[PDB]
Paper text:
[name]ΔMBD crystallised as a symmetric dimer in a head-to-tail configuration. Consistent with previous studies, the structure of the PPXD was less well defined relative to the other domains of the catalytic core, consistent with the idea that the PPXD is structurally mobile. However, because the FLD was not resolved, its effect on the structure of [name] could not be determined. To investigate how the CTT affects the conformation of [name] in solution, we investigated the structures of [name], [name]ΔCTT and [name]ΔMBD using small-angle x-ray scattering (SAXS). The resulting models suggested that the PPXD was positioned considerably closer to NBD2 (i.e. more ‘open’) in [name] and [name]ΔMBD than in [name]ΔCTT (p=2.0×10−5 and 1.1 × 10−7, respectively). In models of [name]ΔMBD and [name]ΔCTT, the PPXDs in the two protomers of the dimers were positioned asymmetrically (p=1.8×10−8 and 0.0085, respectively). Disruption of the MBD alone (i) increases the affinity of [name] for the ribosome, (ii) decreases the affinity of [name] for substrate protein, (iii) inhibits the [name] activity of [name], (iv) increases the thermal stability of [name], (v) prevents [name] from undergoing a conformational change upon binding to nascent substrate protein and (vi) causes a defect in [name] function in vivo. However, disruption of both the MBD and the FLD results in a protein that behaves very similarly to full-length [name], indicating that the FLD mediates these effects. Our work suggests that enclosure of the FLD by the PPXD has the opposite effect—that is, autoinhibition of [name]. We propose that the MBD is the key for unlocking this autoinhibited conformation in the full-length protein.
[name] is an evolutionarily conserved and essential [name] that is required for protein translocation in bacteria. The catalytic core of [name] (amino acids ~1–832 in [name]) contains five domains: nucleotide binding domain-1 (NBD1; amino acids 9–220 and 378–411), the polypeptide crosslinking domain (PPXD; 221–377), nucleotide binding domain-2 (NBD2; 412–620), the α-helical scaffold domain (HSD; 621–672 and 756–832) and the α-helical wing domain (HWD; 673–755). In addition to the catalytic core, most [name] proteins contain a relatively long C-terminal tail (CTT; also known as the C-terminal linker [Hunt et al., 2002]), whose function is not well understood. In [name], the CTT (833-901) contains of a small metal binding domain (MBD; 878–901) and a structurally flexible linker domain (FLD; 833–877).
Numbering used by the authors: 13 to 248, 276 to 290, 295 to 334, 349 to 834
The structure:
Amino acid sequence: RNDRTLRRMRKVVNIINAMEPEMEKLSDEELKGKTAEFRARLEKGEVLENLIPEAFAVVREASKRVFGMRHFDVQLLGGMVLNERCIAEMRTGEGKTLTATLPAYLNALTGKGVHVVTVNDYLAQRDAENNRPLFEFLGLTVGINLPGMPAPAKREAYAADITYGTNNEYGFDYLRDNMAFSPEERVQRKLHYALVDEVDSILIDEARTPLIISGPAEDSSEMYKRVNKIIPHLIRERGLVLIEELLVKEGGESLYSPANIMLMHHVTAALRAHALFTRDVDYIVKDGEVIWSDGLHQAVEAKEGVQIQNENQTLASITFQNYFRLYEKLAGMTGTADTEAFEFSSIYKLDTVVVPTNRPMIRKDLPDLVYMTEAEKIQAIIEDIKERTAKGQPVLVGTISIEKSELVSNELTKAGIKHNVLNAKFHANEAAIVAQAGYPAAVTIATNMAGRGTDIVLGGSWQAEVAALENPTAEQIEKIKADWQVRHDAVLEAGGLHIIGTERHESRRIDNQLRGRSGRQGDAGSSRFYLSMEDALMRIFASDRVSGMMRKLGMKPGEAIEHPWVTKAIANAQRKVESRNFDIRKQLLEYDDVANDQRRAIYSQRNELLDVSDVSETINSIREDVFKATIDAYIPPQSLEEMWDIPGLQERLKNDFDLDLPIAEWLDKEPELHEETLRERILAQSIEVYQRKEEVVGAEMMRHFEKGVMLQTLDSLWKEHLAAMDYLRQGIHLRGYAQKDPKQEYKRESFSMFAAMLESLKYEVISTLSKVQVRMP
């Protein structure tokens, strides 16, 4: 890791820089042609990574001509990092935007597409539109993906060499591609390269945010009707023994758990709407309706024979994490937050890299200061502000709440320090203050600072000064720049922006984001964090004496020392809280792996179906398994004749497979028969009746109706399964309790239920193709 991979990349950077004159000599057309040359070399078997130096140099030259921007060495380093499965930490102002142009080019060369993942659509459109001329200069096409975009335009967007889009719409496009009924319906290609704009939020904070496609269901009016057909048998354990037995329908064992809940909230409702809601008494039936709660309304409609009011359910679901783990290559960017490299490597095998700034980082991060009380802390803070503003140095003070901002505001005013508070209610004022936030001695209080935030220009923004002018002359802009130079230089001499944190937050990342506001692009700066024994943060030592021992080092109302071990102790606490968080996270991700693997498995199988034209083989093969398994249920393999249930098999075949065979007559006529030949008879009859229907309809039509039925049934059982899993998982605050562990039983019932779903899949597919009505000559 380390400078170990950084010096490797610096070596390459030297090669790229060394390449510059070469690239300066080439024509526009020769630069354009480079892409084709690289692609020809890749086709002829060159390793992409070997092209990094040249390709980057080409891109940089292209940017020099097109944008008039020459990527810095560190941008090249970042681009090289982003070629790996790595997270690139790039300080604010280091031009994450421009840097990202490099690995997009490089990973487009293989001709398999690039997905640039933005935080929102505006940036996707902006970056796409702004970068379009660069990549066309180098003979590549750029796509933009938006929610609500027509499928052909989405297809166009994904078929372009480099695509820009948001995280969400990519995920929804995946779900929709995995709801397609033909491969031409797909919008995406094979998921090749994903570059994610803010991985802190997107891959960590939003890791578990579900992306969901919902719809009106379909499988209403079913389960309900069959559950309804069972209850009127019942009279005022038995009843329960009788109920479970009476499912020559859904489900050895055993409604009651863990899965067969569905059935429970389905039954207690059959039942519950029979003696519990009296017919024309508690409600009325008018105009095909019942005129409720928990499946109970739908049951009444099943009982009274009404149209059941089928209603939204989840059709498709995925977390960001589980979607992005599908890409062949994955990379991302963030602000100097990170702190979680090992987490990214654990969860994603993403190594993270701190990319050095173009100019040196010269912010002085001073040691944390600790006081007995809030009041003394505040006093020291006031004193610090007073000293630095006395030097002409501007200050940004960060607080943890509006009340604290007010508190410090009042105190500063009490001390005669002019300042402005940034109030979330007043956006115009915020922008107006931030314009002057870096003016000599300016003092600004911010509450729970957002993230990255508007650059605060040291000495003020002269650019806002001209944007202010009514009718800007030439010599006004000289007075302005000259004055600005002096202010900027004076502020730089006074030490740049000072950052004051009045508390530390429970999460240090917030502190790092506050602190990140100073020292940008090599500007001078400093930071200081202050703490007290009555800070919220000083609660996490869950012990009054313990925290109360620090009071014996004394502090002396303003005669403090600084103990560099305190800062380490504090950082250690916060990294232990973070470790605690990660332990919890890993546990939750262990639960997520079940559904993730289930989805992955089912979608792999679904796409196997989708990718093939002709499902004959699969049909025949699962036909064998289904009928074999089905006969086995009435004729146990290698058992005696007295165990056979022929009426059961004749009813089951007629009812579920529309196949009326004289098996009783077969057995009683030839004592020659034997199982295998009976199984072959049934098979042969089903086959010939089916091939007859094919001869009625045609081959092509059979292949395509087969596919459709496979997919429809797959989808329907999947959506049902998602819901069963949903109820199962949410049910786990009453199922796993007294002594025995929850989880583990969960994975068992998940696997059991998923297995059940695949065999039911086979059964229902074959049943459907066997029951489909054709007018037989």
